[model samples]
Target: EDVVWRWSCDNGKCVKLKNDPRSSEPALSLEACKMFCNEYGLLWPRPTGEADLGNFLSKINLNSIEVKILKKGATDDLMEAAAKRFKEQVSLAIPRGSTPKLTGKAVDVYLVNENPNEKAFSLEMDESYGLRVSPSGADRVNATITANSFFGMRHGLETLSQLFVFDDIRDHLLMVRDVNISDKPVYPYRGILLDTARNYYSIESIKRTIEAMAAVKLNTFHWHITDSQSFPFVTTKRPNLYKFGALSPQKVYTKAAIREVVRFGLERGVRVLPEFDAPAHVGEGWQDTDLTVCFKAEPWKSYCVEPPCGQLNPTKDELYQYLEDIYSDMAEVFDTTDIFHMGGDEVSEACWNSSDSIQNFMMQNRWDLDKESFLKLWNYFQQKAQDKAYKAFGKKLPLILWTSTLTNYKHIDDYLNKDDYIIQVWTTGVDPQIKGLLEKGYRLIMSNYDALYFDCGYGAWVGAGNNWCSPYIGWQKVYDNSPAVIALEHRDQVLGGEAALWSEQSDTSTLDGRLWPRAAALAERLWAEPATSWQDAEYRMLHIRERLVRMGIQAESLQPEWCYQNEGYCYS
Candidate 1:
């Protein structure tokens, strides 16, 4: 006769299944798993593949979870930090289940690394790991996590955390019965771009964002620090830029504060990519300076892309010096030489055409009053900027620019080195224009505005009219964007993609709701196997949403509780 077992939650409710509910043999079908115990809340960007051990551990005592480092000369602190995070999470998990008192040791979680003395976190850091959890002996368990480097260990910890979930039927009984997982990211550069220029975000808010990113295994944070509305980054070389340019004196990110944020990100295995948009997006901050021109004074009308028409005067030698000084300071603070984004998008020619000095400079260079001449000037400016950055850092940093640069100047390769720059494609959904760039041997990062732009779904910014982009992007749209659509031959040129949250209509209060769960879709798309179906992803995300909320992220739910509980019975 087949044996049947029943498990009860804290609310005195119970779920019944044949034999062991967590057993790997006679594996429960997906439908049965959903109906029985909510599949232990397994959610998406689901693991590559996981197997149930067909066994259950009544208790996963937090005090028993020990972190061990096997590599010689490896810092114990790394393992200790991992232990601390695990303890905090397990402590929360145990209470939801049965009232199991603090008892004997249960499991040992090992952090084994082949190279313990690797360099600290970086954009190019290795992030790959294997996790195994099995029954070591009677009434106890032993799990080992192995990675090539510390970064991979960080990712392994994140995966391990997700394995523990609260079972609602069991009255929130923390459940981690049986499972074995081996996970790795598909793309090297999985990122989210947060625009902090239009609106200011406090340091704490930034830290919270990093924590959320860590939870999802996102490796990079593209920080759009300065833009047309404000220059909130405090720089020693140009102190007045923030003093006079920011919305107020108090709204600024000091050098020390930047370092603190960087360190915070490093601890969580996230790299912060800083951007200071220039030429087109430089606003009223530089009106008093001679490096730029065409300010319309108060009540301005069409100065630059937005207003007050401020851009670095490419004709002036001092402009290049300013850029060099600012970049040098950024390099010193960020301490990473991987990639620097140069804002070369949406530069309007009207400002340059309106200035007499700019006209004279163009005339001297044998350039006409057309788009080609402007491209020539921009090419020269970028070349000089590259030279300055090389001088300051003693090495040339890889550069990235907006797609508009390539669109306007078709022959950009004739001017700038093709290998030095990566093009960021944000025109629309899988822009055909990107195909041309790929054919020309250009690397690209897809940020397709129509799909990945997060700030649009909500209405316009506060105190502003309905001037925002239309048709808000939902999670499904973000997941549908496949980088492979660009043809298999040229797919290698696709570096990765980022979900951009332009802050024109977002701030700290609204940031969490705006980014979470939705950005998680993009995270899974970039990391998981390409063949994973969206249907499976949707099911996993529905569950993952609850996890985010419980973890203190204000993520919006995609479906109601009934829809999730009923599974297939819900509305289409």
Candidate 2:
């Protein structure tokens, strides 16, 4: 019995390699395999383009850090704002005032651009950047970051911040001396869907979430601000919504706070989108009027998805004006002039049938009180509400809606159009709706519950160990998810994806740990879509988690420091 076993990483999996492993990079131990696979130290996502050198490490004195813009033409407001942001962030990245044992004066970052007229943030924004790092004058370091727009340079700064690591023995920050790297995201719509109504979170917590998202290159923050359980968004135009619907006065997000959050997100390269989930996910905010049919009705399962059941009464003539006021407020405060999400998921037929006025209108229209009629009603509401939103915002914005029964391929043409709505799929990965929507030429943003629902696998809020979606989704599953690969022939239609965390079992206390590190795992998938497996990401994942904590976030721990230090030793 003279047998020894080793391992190698292949096809996004770690495989045992006793012999004929189909790899030239085999190692004597699993740890060695992991160590070899994770070549870079603590760099979360591998670069899409890189040069021929990983040596000549340089050090930067945390004492003096600077970010400057080298403008070739007339500077715009966006460039100036970005430069101010980078300077503030880079200094905070490292421990300030740490005494340097030797002497390195500073890390000078110069942000430059080619086409200066491009200062708009949109789905079409060119978020591509090139970065170079070299020693300046033997003692100081200079990093030049070049990009097409302010957004790209911000990412360049995110990457630049990661290059420097604390040197414990030398008492300084070690960085790459000579390097050439050009990087861009694989998808433009990488985001996180955060539902704030189920459990309230402070504005500060929301900021931290965006900060973490930026550090990992996620560009969208889908702020699902209200749901059936609560309405925390306050508007002066619709004061009654918050007065009667908010969980409390303290729970609401004032217009000023909303604008501040949007401004903060913009500075960090995140588009904070306020989602007003309508029709079905409407309860607390509409209970003061007849706009909602089943406000907290019992036998809730028959009326809505959960307790405190409610659904909007779409037939009411006054309801359109009511919704218009909210949209007008949102347009002014949320800065949602170019894009908006009018939640069109989970509309209930029974709730509408319960309303006598709605039933009367259906009878007068000679329509059956059935799924078909209900969809027609929902579509009618969507058109009117969208028209109102456009009236207030003074522009026709791209609208996003969740996948529902109405999006079924058989009759989706009667309800939704590919040009009008961008569908966000929340069904499982294997659901046919995804393929149908994509095949029908509809642009999509994916949050397939099987892969991206962060709320899954937790203990049921209504029951014990019976979470609707169970079996915790670990990082590997998230890392392997590639909608482009899944879409195959129709990959171009896939705009991007988001990982969503609903707050039934989580709150401000557990938000960061539940979202981070794992979301970071997806950050790599959506950004780089690496050719390797999670085994290759283990060390880098740990490093980013450490960085998150150091940057004042509560990112969950993956393993002990020993496992992080000895990469290969962590695995059995």
Candidate 3:
């Protein structure tokens, strides 16, 4: 190896080696270590600690690192997956010449709890684990990773993978090998919402998202399957909907494909929470049907936020049956969670008010064609849909809706069961919105558009114009979301947060660039210690971007290439 490198702190700026000056000793003295720590940055999510061991001549050879499962609570398949992921990630991080071989002394894993049912992947799964790495002997390194569930082991592996750093001075991969991490997620639901409706994404692209999610230990994949722009989900009961609503016949996701995506997510410990955003975001799918009004033919122009302002024809019995049939099919295909997202957001009364048929139906029923009447209609639809789901599947699926449903309805508790639904807060003033939901005793998922909406910042896609205009949510804003801002008693009501990417300006080609590195900021916020410094996180994220790039994601670069190439150097 002919690579020559050294640590250089010239004129108060940190940089890679320059010919001007050099330190005689390779190892840093206590003062020099302090100076280096002050000049450069610390690790991301800042681990518990790694106690100092006196300097030794020998370096632990990564080329022969081995993984040995001492205890087996996880499935053989999962264990194999863990080993493969470890090898793959580590191999990528290390330099090509110094890359590890799959033939070393074993890194042991022990599953403390032997719960067999943990392997039967479900939505509300536990992911908690403890990991300890230590020097074994003069030439050997040992790591003991212990977890009660495979999900925890998966998280532990990700943390373990992050420990390795390329030592440019030595020109090899180096790790402390003396780390003891007892890590667990602050919230159970750390998620990313991918809107496939605004623009279609292939199954391969979705799988790629899952892979990236797994790498960062994100647990939920909120699949916003359909919206006003498109209905790309293929329903067996209403094949015509897919035929008419999709951009083309080949664009829709089949039943088998949905199952495969769910299965793929399960294997990686990520729950696929399917969302069929309805009532407002329905396009041509409900144009010919009795389910919606004012779609193509409308007296009410520009009533809804998106174009072609329309609402589900709440007056129709057939509309209820349509939702029942669609959700019934969803239950059959997406067999993971008991909770289903019934998009009860942005229901404009203008469409319902403008329609003479709807007004007549309301008048006959002695009801005003107003917001209150719309609330009752929404409640009835939700109750009937829940009933149908139970009748069809023999299990009651709880409903999750956007925050607008609760806020718009003056008497939400009067009509809807508080326990039957979870409020996803995406509107502005999220802190107060979450507070209000918690006050009403409703569970909630924090998806504040100001901070978590990834689609907002970027300009709308070419030809789409300024339809999707909003401020850019940088990584700092995502990480700055402090859960403690919510009332202490209502904190438990906060299920977790989700980074929502509406995908109007995003597609498969631009997905990775749009999501990654920034998404990782939210990941640390949801998973690591609550008090992690943004400064420390920035340094780690720069390196992480490199890792993501190597792993096939087109993650946006946070820093210059020299910052990544020189590690501790290049940072002021």
Candidate 4:
């Protein structure tokens, strides 16, 4: 041979070995370096930054290893909380019918952060981590996890746990002996938006979702707490919001329950960003007071998207007083949160156009009733509401709003200031508003209905036949809908994309079936942003689905067992 090159997997990437090429096996090409390493099992969301793996496996007796976090600076309770969770999760991940085994080597985690207890989980925390595993002795392997923050450490520990797989024959766990992984999500705002108002989900079920989301490295739980249908978000600041809005007293998410969810998410490296979808998605919550006009307006078609129609009466000065109280309640509960979602979507202008008081209010301001007045009033509500939130929270946190007439091409610039508001696109992927928002230098969180809407493809709740966005968005479709498709124009402006499950067609019973695997597909999209398509992701997707079910997630299946067992050969 004219030449030979030796290579090794290092720090999550393949690199040339400078030593004697003949010392080990010769790698004729770089492809061999990758192909050989690919033979080993990998962590889900596939370590975006760097990764290296070895096919040669080893068995890790879970009972043996001691997990510890070493930190130099003053330790925070949050770090300990995360560590406790890691231990608890490791215990939970242990496969059923697992036999007891002798002790193995220890896993030393190094938390290398400027602040061990950095309060306030912002939209932009460096969630990057590095993990390494190598042979220590014949019976055990040495492991080290390094991260710059609690969030990163949390992810590193998550990656470490994912390294082990249940052994079929041995009935123990199998782990890749030599592993190097440097991981970070491509987008900081990887998330799922669940509408709790459509059907109230118990705290237990809600926590289950947060646990599942953490497993996939999703950072945000966009809790759409209220909608036109109902208001289940209970608050002492104004208890009647739930009193008048909830399906029943039993269905409400109490303040204590809210705190519990927030804490649970925090320990798992997830942020519960509660969305108070106002202006339009408010019927039951504001019914007792005339805080809304066109409350459950007639003919259904004239007022709202669904049967019950309502729009927050922007003219009412008392609305801000009540809104501030609710915002303060959320501030106390969802502590250390950086951003808020003030949903401003699907505002039926007709709803306000029909309102006598709203019309009178517009006339007083000398605003155009034909066009400028509606958008103006809507913008005024948003501005005042955002002010209320800032007044209550004592900080001007970036607010998220759904795409609406205000975000439309014609008036987006006039009403919405890019610095103050972020847009969450709910329209079709091709909607010009997405590109426009990016061009305007406004950050966007995509939930573009064409691909990311998990509630699509089911039977229409309103009438017979398929729902508006039908033909079921498969995991494959979700995998292929890249953030780059639209965000590539201004990639930095894209905080990340989200998979939404509007609860009109979903409830606690249908939650798992509709969202998993498919939402997991989107999670990977936001996490790794793989250059390849779903075809390459199929193997991992199928594997993780089973893992999720094992963790009690109740994830739905895509292909047959035979198909997955056969691997690439099953692809038609």
Best by lDDT: 4
Of 1 and 3, the candidate ranking higher by lDDT: 1
lDDT of each: 0.70, 0.77, 0.69, 0.78
Better of 2 and 3 by TM-score: 2
Worst 10 residues of 3 by lDDT: 28-37
For candidate 1, write residues 171-232 as lDDT tens digits: 33233556666767767777888888888888888888888888777878888988867888
lDDT of 2: 0.77
- TM for every model, in the order presented, reads 0.88, 0.90, 0.87, 0.90
- Colliding pairs, model 2: 31-568
- lDDT by residue (tens digit), candidate 3, 195-270: 9888899999899889888888888898999887778889889877788889878788999899999988877888
RMSD of each: 5.2, 6.5, 4.1, 7.0
Which residue pairs overlap in candidate 4's backbone?
12-50, 12-51, 12-52, 64-103, 64-104
Deviation of model 1 at 24, angstroms? 21
Off by over 4 Å in 2: 1-37, 51-53, 72-102
TM-score, model 3 to reference: 0.87
| Cα distance off (Å), candidate 3, residue 278 | 2.3
Worst 10 residues of 4 by lDDT: 26-35
Model 2, 291: alpha-carbon shift in Å?
A: 1.0
